[PDB]
Amino acid sequence: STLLENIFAIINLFKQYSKKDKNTDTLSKKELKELLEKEFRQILKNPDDPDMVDVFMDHLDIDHNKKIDFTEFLLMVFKLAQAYYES
Amino acid sequence: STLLENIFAIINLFKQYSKKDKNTDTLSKKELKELLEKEFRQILKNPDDPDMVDVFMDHLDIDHNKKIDFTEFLLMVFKLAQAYYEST
Ligand SMILES: [Ca+2]
Ligand SMILES: [Ca+2]
Ligand SMILES: [Ca+2]
Ligand SMILES: [Ca+2]
Known part of the structure; x- marks a missing residue:
């Protein structure tokens, strides 16, 4: 609804899969696949x-x-955003 | 909500403000302020x-x-995401 809610949702989405293991601030190969x-x-x-x-x-x-940290994850998120923006 | 819903929410947020004048694909100073x-x-x-x-x-x-295009806008959104990732 709000821009902030979307940003927190993206953050929580990432942490849901990244914190599955020892390396909690990054996504492993299996976690990304998940x-x-x-x-x-x-x-x-x-x-x-x-x-x-x-x-x-x-x-x-x-x-x-x-490993895929949040920054690397974000770059992909905003590439999709940038790509979907086509109408 | 999914990631794809959030991405589109961000896209539609930019659009609802950018199209208030004849420059649909960018945010004016007034549009940005709002x-x-x-x-x-x-x-x-x-x-x-x-x-x-x-x-x-x-x-x-x-x-x-x-004028602020979408890519320029996404830079803002990118920075906010990084910052609040430290807050949580
Ligand atoms: Ca991990
Ligand atoms: Ca990496
Ligand atoms: Ca505009
Ligand atoms: Ca510009």
Whole structure:
């Protein structure tokens, strides 16, 4: 409804999957896959979900530490936003 | 709510304010001012002249065309998300 509510929702969404393990401020490969399978599905990755998790991990992981922090997550979120904006 | 609903909410929020004039795809100074007032509410109705729009305009208007496009707007949203991720 409000801009702030949406932002908190994005934050809580990320933490739901990131805090699944020891590394609570980042998404592991499996946690991302979990996220990619629920919150946005055939919408985005067109999931052959057992197959194309790896390519997406490498797209987002721009510092190459095998984990997806919130910033890297956000960059993807706002790319989709920027992309969907087309009417 | 899903992520995709929140993304579209942010998109439609920008649109409802950007289309109040003939420049549908950008936010004017007036349109921007109303967005900031509604979305970021200064409860203390005390104005030592509050220019939230002018200071924001300088920060957000990268190309200096005195309009805020969606990408420029998303920069604001990006910063807020990062900040409140520390608050939680
Ligand atoms: Ca994790
Ligand atoms: Ca990383
Ligand atoms: Ca406009
Ligand atoms: Ca501009």
